[PDB]
Amino acid sequence: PKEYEWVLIAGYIIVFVVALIGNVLVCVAVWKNHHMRTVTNYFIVNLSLADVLVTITCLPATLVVDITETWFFGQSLCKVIPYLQTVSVSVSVLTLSCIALDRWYAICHPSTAKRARNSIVIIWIVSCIIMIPQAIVMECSTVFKTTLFTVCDERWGGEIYPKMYHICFFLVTYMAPLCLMVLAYLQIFRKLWCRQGIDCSFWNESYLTGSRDERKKSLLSKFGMDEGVTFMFIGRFDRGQKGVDVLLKAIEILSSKKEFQEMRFIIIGKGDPELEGWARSLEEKHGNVKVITEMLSREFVRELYGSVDFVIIPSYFEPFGLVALEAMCLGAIPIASAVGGLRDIITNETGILVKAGDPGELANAILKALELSRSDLSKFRENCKKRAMSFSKQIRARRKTARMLMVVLLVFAICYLPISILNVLKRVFGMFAHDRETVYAWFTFSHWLVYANSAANPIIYNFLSGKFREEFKAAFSC
């Protein structure tokens, strides 16, 4: 014995050094730089600690056993080292699960460091408890006389128990949390990439020409309106969704007031023929109200956002205030409902918030926007622009971290698939009961791969995380 031995020793050494240095540097990076202190990164630290554990205590023993096919260490270590192995695996899996859970909770339904600490502690306790059977079953057996060798292996009192235990181990440490994390991360993907975001390259002021005053003058001239504060609605005509009913009702409330003559309204969209007719009746009734049911290009809408004073977003429900972001990027000030999404983007410095379906509150907000429009609104518009850009920035960042995490999950799944399938085939379906060197080679490789995962994570952080890469950079600077 044996071929593939030098590549096994070499690979184990490489993995050992890279995993040790790498995960230690991960922990150092998070601990010494405060901007690194996020829930995700605390969890990541936990992961690296588990990896360091299994790297120090299990990897060498595994190399020796896979090389010699014997157990030189004691009975105690024959209990301990497999126990530490399984515990490390459990900690890793549950840590990934808590990461995915955290991201899902923060992204799909918009988590403190204390909560995260509790999560960590729980993870380690659960992991240590559920892996007690592993420690119980492991036994040393003497095989033969001139010599004798001892091997360390699971001792079962039947054929059913190992099958059940390894089914359970496969489900708990691999299959179920993997499935759950996949579901969570695909929902997260759909949320962050497909439903969130904004064409920042299109929705910016650079494409418009002339001052805002000139554009507004052109706007009102084109619409056949006198000068005055201009409000804009763009959503669909629904009852209980985009809230054009709230706006129409509030317009009726305002129409009796003397301030109404100072206001201008641009209501755009299709939908309920009753609401469309209501809009058209209000349009025919008042000269300072214009209704557009026809389809408008993005360029025209962009010009609108860059010309009007305020944009009214009276939604009952708005998970993604993309209209708000588009308008704010072009200097339009939002008067929106305090529903989650608009509630997220807009603050009291970057717009006006109102109760979702209260026409009185909306009319009051419109009046307030008028009195506010009696003076310079520059600072306000700039605040809106910078808030929108900041929000978009945050979305892109969340995309980066989420992609990194997904990649880690994938690499984990890949790294643990072979040993999983092998264990299930051997222990549950009783295969490999008959050419042994091939099976043994597959097993040695699978073991090495499992340990290779631990070295895989930190370099993943290096290539897919700017902050981690920068701290790694600072570390290796001699």
Ligand X SMILES: Cc1ccc(-n2nccn2)c(C(=O)N2CCN(c3nc4cc(Cl)ccc4o3)CC[C@H]2C)c1
What's the closest the beta carbon of residue 90 comes to ligand X, in angstroms?
9
What does the alpha-carbon distance between residue 402 and residue 464 come to, in Å, rounded to a whole number?
A: 10
Minimum CB separation of residue 99 from ligand X in Å reads 19
Minimum distance, C-beta of residue 51 to ligand X, in the bound complex (Å): 13
Q: Identify residue 358 by its one-letter amino acid code.
A: D
Would the annotation count 423 as a binding residue?
yes
Nearer to ligand X, 60 or 360 (CB): 60
- CB of 313 within 8 A of CB of 342? yes
The amino acid occupying position 173 is T
User: Which CB sits closer to ligand X, 65 or 244?
Assistant: 65
Q: Which of 156/189 has CB closer to ligand X?
A: 156
C-alpha to C-alpha distance for 397 and 410, rounded to whole angstroms: 20
The answer to whether 286 and 197 are in contact (CB under 8 A) is no
Q: Which is nearer to ligand X, 140 or 253 (CB)?
A: 140
CB of 419 to ligand X, least distance (A): 4
HEC profile for the chain? CCCCHHHHHHHHHHHHHHHHHHHHHHHHHHHHCHHHCCHHHHHHHHHHHHHHHHHHHCHHHHHHHHHHCCCCCCHHHHHHHHHHHHHHHHHHHHHHHHHHHHHHHHHCCCCCHHHHHHHHHHHHHHHHHHCHHHHHHEEEEEECCCCCEEEEEECCCCCHHHHHHHHHHHHHHHHHHHHHHHHHHHHHHHHHHHHCCCCCCCCCHHHCCCCHHHHHHHHHHHHCCCCCEEEEECCCECCCCCCHHHHHHHHHHHCCCHHHHHEEEEEECCECHHHHHHHHHHHHHCCCEEEECCCCCHHHHHHHHCCCCEEEECCCCCCCCHHHHHHHCCCCEEEEECCCCHHHHCCCCCCEEECCCCHHHHHHHHHHHHHHHCCCCHHHHHHHHHHHHHHHHHHHHHHHHHHHHHHHHHHHHHHHHHHHHHHHHHHCCCCCCCCCHHHHHHHHHHHHHHHHHHHHHHHHHHHHCHHHHHHHHHHCCC
Instruction: Tell me how far apart the alpha carbons of residues 334 and 384 are, in angstroms, rounded to a whole number.
Output: 8
Please state the closest distance from residue 173 (CB atom) to ligand X, in A: 6
Residue numbers at the binding site for ligand X (CB under 6 A): 58, 61-62, 65, 81-82, 85-86, 89, 134, 169, 173, 419, 423, 447, 450
**For helices 75-107 and 113-130, what crossing angle results, to 10°?**
150
Closer residue to ligand X (CB): 89 or 325: 89
Give the nearer residue to ligand X in terms of CB position, either 61 or 181.
61
Closest distance to ligand X from the beta carbon of 452 (Å): 11
CB closer to ligand X, 189 vs 440: 440
Q: Provide, rounded to whole angstroms, the least separation between the CB of residue 269 and ligand X.
A: 56
Cα-trace Rg, the chain: 32
Binding site as annotated, residues = 423
Binding site as annotated, residues for suvorexant = 423
